[PDB]
Every structure is written in C-alpha cells, then in structure tokens.
C-alpha cells in the first residue's frame, strides 16, 4: 500500500509524539498487522506497542472528559507509562487522576497505586467521614487506612505526610492530622483468594459445533451454515443470525476436523449394529472431507435432500461431507 | 380447558380411526402434554402414541402425494404399525410404498424390509440393468441380490418367488427368471461398522455458556442476556439474535450454576495473587446467586457499569451475580 508504509516509517523514526504513535499502532492493528509484524518493520517492541495504544486511549479520555490544558501539554509528549496505569479507571475518573498525576509529577509505579486508590474509594455510595470524592482525598484516604495498620515506626509519619500532600479538602487533612495524636491499630483483613481454575494441560478442551437441524433436511440447509472461527485466546464463537449449537468433548477426531457440523437423526439411518431399538443419534460430519472410500459413511445430496450412505464403488455424485462421529444420548 | 379434555376423552374411548388419534396426540404435545401425561389420562401407551403420530404423518404423505383411493380407505382405519415402518422414506416414495403394501396385504415386519429395499434402490442414479424405479422392482431387486448370495437351498426358490410376486416390469421378471438357469454365487460385502462414540458415564460433559462481552461493559448489557435452555436429549442451545458462546469443561460448580454467564476481562480486576503479570481472564458468574458474603466476589451495578468487588460488610447495593470461576488462557 502507501499509508501502511508511511505509518510504519513514522514509528520507525519515532517521529511525532507518543500519542501519535499509539494511534498509528491502532491503525495498523485495525488494518491487519499483528504485534510481531510491527516489530519486524519498526523498532517498536510489542510491550511498548500495547502501552502506547492504551496510553493514547487514556489520553483520549483526558481530552474528552475535561482535564487541564497544562496536563495535556505534559502528557502529549511524555508519560505514556503513567497513563497506561490509569487504564482500568473510567473516562471521568481518568481526567481527574491525570490532573492529579501531573500536579504531583508522579512516576508510573506511584500512579499504579493512585489508580488502585481511586477505584477502591469509588466503591462507597456513602463516603468515609471527612473525605470527598476528589482523587486527592481518595489517595489520602488510602494513606489514612494504611497508616493505622502500622502502629510502630516512622512509616506512620511517612504515610501521614503522603496523605497531607495529596488531600484536597480541609476535613480530610484533619482526619489525617488526628493520627499524630491517636496511636491505635486498626488492622484490616486481607482480600479473599478469588476462585481460580486452570485449564488442565494434560486433557483436552471441549469444542462447540454448529447444528443444522433434525433430518429430514435439505442440501441447501447444510451449505448455508458458515464455517466457525474460534476467537483466541478462549476459543469464543460469535454469530449474528439464527443458529443452534452443541458443546462436545475434545475427541481427537473432532479437534482434527477442519469444518465440522452436527445433524440430529436416528440410529436406523445406519445399519442396525446390535439388538437395541432405534433411538436418537447425534451425527458429526466434516464438510472438508469429501474424497470417497469404502470403509466410511458420507452425507450426500440426494436430489435436494440430505442422506447418509456408504459406497462400495466410487460414486458419480457430489459428497457434502464425511461422517466422523455417531453418539447416542447420555445414559439415564 | 375444554378442548384438552375432549381430545383426551376421544383417545380414552378410541373413538375415531387411528389417524384421528395420531392427530389428537399431535395436538396434545403441541399444547404441552408429554407422553407420560397422556398415558395417565387415556389408556394410550407412549409407544403406541409415537406409532400413531408418525403413522398419521405417513398417512398424510399418502394423501398429499397421490396414492390410490382404495389404499387410503384401508389405511384410514387399519395398519398404523405398517405405515410407521415407512417413516424414513420421502413423501413421494411413501405413497408408492403404501400402494404396494396395500396391494400385497403386508404385515409390519415385511413392510420394514420393503422400506429398506426402497431406500437402498434409490441410491442409484443409473439403475440396475432391467429394473425400474417402481417399488415392486425395487423389492424385486432386493430379492434378486439376496438370492444370488445363497447358492444352496430352496431359499433361492422362495426368494425367486418373492421377486416375481413383487416385480412391476417385464424386464425385471426375466432378470429374476435367469436365476433358475444360472446357479452361481455373487456374495456381497457387509456394510462398514459406523463410527460410534459413547458419552462416558464416569466423567462430566461440557457446558456451553453465553458471553456478554469484554469489560468495560454496562449493567444493561448483562441483564439483556437471556437464560439458556438446554434442549434434551443432547443439550442443544438454539438462539435467534446476535450472541457469543464458549464451551467450558463440566466443572462441578458450573454444572451446578442455575444461570451462568461469561465476562472477558483481565487479572488486575482482582487482587494480584502471585508475581505474574496482568493477563486475560475468563470470568463466569451465576446471576442466580445474589446473597452477600465476605469470602467471595460479585458483579455489581456501579452506577451503570459492571465491576467486580468483594465486601467486608453487607452492601447497600444491587448485586447482579456471583463470581464462580476465574480462568487464564490455556498454556502455549
């Protein structure tokens, strides 16, 4: 192209300000370039790629939601690592935090904690006594609650100083001043361990498979079913129209299948195998397996309708797919 | 009601012809009555319930697709077990088979084989030499190919007689007459064993779970996601609009969940657990678990947007669901 080589050139030189870079890197992902592609062409590491996209998204919130014009001048050319740490905030509480981080000329580590403070503090419908919702009070409320847990050292003083540096309101300053008179512990309980599961390396994950419908069915109905694209990293499946789905185990032949599809039918569509009576069967076919052979079953276009047969001799026919799985319903 | 007690009464008396019964039993399933309900009220066993629904569906094809008026007179009051065995045929080849089964006054076992013959024979684009597509020739072609495999007994004669009884065309009669002169084997290979899988009793099946979207998200987006109804016997899921899906393992807490929903997010929405860096996490919440407690995490309406927090004290809030699963993407 022409705009796909000029954007990459700007990044290769680090021409503009970092905000520009973040938008250029947005524009390349938008148009197909993965992190690894961009690092090949430009110098940009993929860590720094992510930092500046998100960083610019934050800077955008700093613009839309009304931070100081002095703030924007500073963060337009510097402080991508800092704005990146405000990512989990909201647009409105980003502009507030950004004004605060400019004011106190804050490095990225300290801004990570400022952001933690601002979120912890916005989980109050009724606010703590003496503290307002200005992020200075919020990071001062954090300095308050932390200093009380310590009972021993000059760390109390260091944290009391912090709270006084940051606090916005007079009421919060005095709430903090009280800790120079009042020496008691209030310790806090640690947060509960969240319910983590690990996908086991040693066994296989399930696969979601589309479902055309119950036989009797028409050849057009099967061919109208799109191929499914699993969206990494969690193998999601998004789809727009009407559809039915089934989640099946990760059998080897099913993970293998390039394009599988499910058809509900009965066991008497196939040769009777033992003595048991005709019941419901779930049939999986791979549409991308259409070469004949004499040991397997296939879905065929039987003049406008779907049918499962087998073949002793190469058929003068179109084969729509190959049957890879037959399964009866789970027991009682 | 009033029409839900009069239909059941007609079945309780066996008032009309069996075709009527099949439609009445259709009408009760249409309006909520399961097989077991109907057997409680009427005498009708649920085997005979199924036979007469399907049977009447076949009889319907006998009408639409133009069988003899004499046939319909016979099958209107008799022969439900016979028409049931023609179920896997098509509308057009049902009327043909029905004319044939009337003509030869055939019991249900023999009609099961007539139907097998008619389907095997319609898998020919080019037909066998001497045989037409009239079902008489088809069941005669079956008698032909079977008699050749035997080389020994009067079973050849019995089968030759059958073929001559049924055959429609003169050309097929002579194809069969030849087997009184010509005594050779042509044996046929048995059909391949189809690829059967059994759902293992001893381990758990996967569960398909809806996906709202990637945080940041709005409280309305989660509440607009319907509950999912798994359609037995294969736990299908059908849905009309736009939706995203994920198939997760059958963990105990997930099968338990009455109404689970998936939210994509990052690990730094929760307390940092070990040293590892913030990555993507998949979050499962049960919307039907909204009672507070101090050992777990919940999704809350944070003034119009979704948020995961925990609680030391009962919150003056609405809880939208409880977090039951956190999982990172599968390893490399």
Keyword list:
homodimer; 332 residues; alpha+beta; Umud Fragment, subunit A; seven-stranded mixed β-sheet; 13 helices; elongated; Raf1_C (chains A, B); RAF1 (chains A, B); carbon dioxide fixation (chains A, B); chaperone (chains A, B); Raf1_cyn (chains A, B)
Radius of gyration of chain A: 31 Å
What's the structural domain tally of chain A? 2
Portion of residues within helices of chain A: 40-55%
Largest interface: A-B, 72 and 72 residues
Give the overall shape of chain A, derived from the CA principal axes: elongated
Order of helices and strands of chain A: HHHHHHHHHHHEEHEEHEEEEE
Largest sheet, strands/sense/barrel of chain A: 7 strands, mixed
- Note the total helix count of chain A: 13
Distance between the termini of chain A: 61 Å
Total number of strands of chain A:
9
Task: Report the portion of residues of chain A in β strands.
Answer: 15-25%
Structural class of chain A: alpha+beta
Biggest sheet strand order of chain A reads: 4-2-5-6-9-7-8
Multimeric state: homodimer
PDB class: chaperone
Keywords: RuBisCO, Chaperone, Raf1
Assembly: dimeric
Entry title: Crystal structure of RuBisCO accumulation factor Raf1 from Anabaena sp. PCC 7120
């Amino acid at each position: 192209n022409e705009l796909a080589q000029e954007l990459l050139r700007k990044l290769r030189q680090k021409q503009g300000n970092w905000v520009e870079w973040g938008q250029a890197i947005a524009s390349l992902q938008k148009s197909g370039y993965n992190p690894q592609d961009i690092f090949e062409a430009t110098g940009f590491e993929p860590v720094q790629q992510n930092q500046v996209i998100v960083g610019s998204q934050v800077y955008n919130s700093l613009e839309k939601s009304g931070a100081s014009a002095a703030t924007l001048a500073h963060y337009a050319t510097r402080g991508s690592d800092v704005l990146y740490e405000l990512r989990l905030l909201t647009h409105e509480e980003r502009a507030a935090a950004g004004d605060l981080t400019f004011t106190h000329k804050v490095d990225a580590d300290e801004a990570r904690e400022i952001a933690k403070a601002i979120k912890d503090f916005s989980r109050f419908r009724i606010l703590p006594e003496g503290f307002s919702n200005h992020p200075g009070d919020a990071v001062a409320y954090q300095a308050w609650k932390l200093a009380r847990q310590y009972s021993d050292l000059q760390e109390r003083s260091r944290l009391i100083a912090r709270g006084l540096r940051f606090a916005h309101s007079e009421t919060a300053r005095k709430q903090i001043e009280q800790l120079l008179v009042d020496f008691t512990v209030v310790s806090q309980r640690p947060a509960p361990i969240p319910p983590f599961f690990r996908f086991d390396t040693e066994d296989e994950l399930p696969r979601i498979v589309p479902v055309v419908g119950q036989l009797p069915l028409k050849a057009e109905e099967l061919k109208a079913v799109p191929l499914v694209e699993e969206i990494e990293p969690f193998r999601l499946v998004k789809f727009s129209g009407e559809q039915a789905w089934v989640a099946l185990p990760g059998w080897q032949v099913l993970l293998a299948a390039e394009d599988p599809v499910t058809i509900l039918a009965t066991s008497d569509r196939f040769p009777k195998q033992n003595q048991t009576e005709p019941g419901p069967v779930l049939v999986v076919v791979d549409r991308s397996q259409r070469e004949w052979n004499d040991f397997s079953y296939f879905v065929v276009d039987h003049d406008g309708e779907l049918d499962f047969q087998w073949f002793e001799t190469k058929p003068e026919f179109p084969i729509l797919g190959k049957v890879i799985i037959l399964v009866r319903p789970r027991r009682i």
